[PDB]
Paper text:
Here, we have characterized [name], a biofilm-dispersing nuclease from a marine strain of [name], and present its crystal structure together with the biochemistry and a mutational analysis required to confirm its active site. When the secondary structure of the single stranded substrates were calculated, position 20 tended to occur at the boundary between predicted single and double stranded regions of the DNA. It has already been shown that BlNucB had no detectable activity against total RNA purified from the periodontitis-associated oral bacterium Veillonella parvula in comparison to the positive control, RNase A. Therefore, BlNucB is a Mn2+/Mg2+-dependent, non-specific endonuclease that can cleave both single- and double-stranded substrates, but with a preference for double stranded DNA. [name], on the other hand, is necessary for the degradation of eDNA for the dispersal of bacterial biofilms. BlNucB diverges from this general description because glutamate replaces the histidine, and this glutamate is essential for biological activity; therefore BlNucB is the founding member of a novel subfamily of the His-Me finger nuclease superfamily.
To understand the molecular basis of its nuclease activity, the structure of BlNucB was solved by single wavelength anomalous dispersion (SAD) from the intrinsic sulphur atoms in the protein and refined to a resolution of 1.35 Å. Overall, BlNucB is a single, compact domain comprising five β-strands and three α-helices that forms a rough triangular pyramid with an approximate diameter of 25 Å. The core of the protein is formed by the five β-strands in a bipartite β-sheet, with β-strands with topological order 1, 5 and 2 separated from β-strands 3 and 4 by the β3-β4 loop that breaks the continuity of the β-sheet. The β3-β4 loop is stabilized in part by the formation of a disulphide bond between β2 residue Cys66 and the β3-β4 loop residue Cys100. Instead, the flat base of the pyramid contains a 15 Å deep, 10 Å wide, 20 Å long concave depression that is formed mostly by conserved amino acids. The base of the depression is predominantly negatively-charged, whereas the lips of the cavity are mostly positively-charged. The surface depression is of sufficient size to accommodate a single strand of DNA, presenting the scissile phosphodiester bond to the catalytic apparatus, whilst the lips of the cavity can interact with the DNA phosphate backbone. There is no metal ion bound in the apo structure of BlNucB reported here and, despite repeated attempts, we were unable to obtain diffracting crystals containing either bound divalent cations or oligodeoxynucleotides. As with other members of the His-Me finger family, BlNucB retains the metal-binding pocket, including the metal-chelator Asn117 and, as in Vvnendo, BlNucB encodes an acid (Asp93) immediately before Glu94 and located so that with minimal changes to the sidechain chi angles it can be positioned to co-ordinate directly to a bound divalent cation.
Author numbering: 34 to 142
The structure:
Amino acid sequence: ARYDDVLYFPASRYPETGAHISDAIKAGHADVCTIERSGADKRRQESLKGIPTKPGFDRDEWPMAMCEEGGKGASVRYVSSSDNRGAGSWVGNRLNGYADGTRILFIVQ
């Protein structure tokens, strides 16, 4: 199998994050997150290298840094901080029901 469970991303609540994820998947970035939480700092170092900060915005990454698929090569987009921080908290809580190694297909479309 390709994935273990599916997650329908809450695009109505966090539309800017959702739009990024949708576009990134249509650009060939992985739609499955193989959860690997320990590596997330190293993966952010890699994905964000050389990308300046912008006020009012966070640098959103897809694939996410908490996934094996993240890090080097990830799509990065400036997303309003409230949208991105809300999405981040939502995802961390929702995925807290799944052990590391679980493969989650994200669907936004």
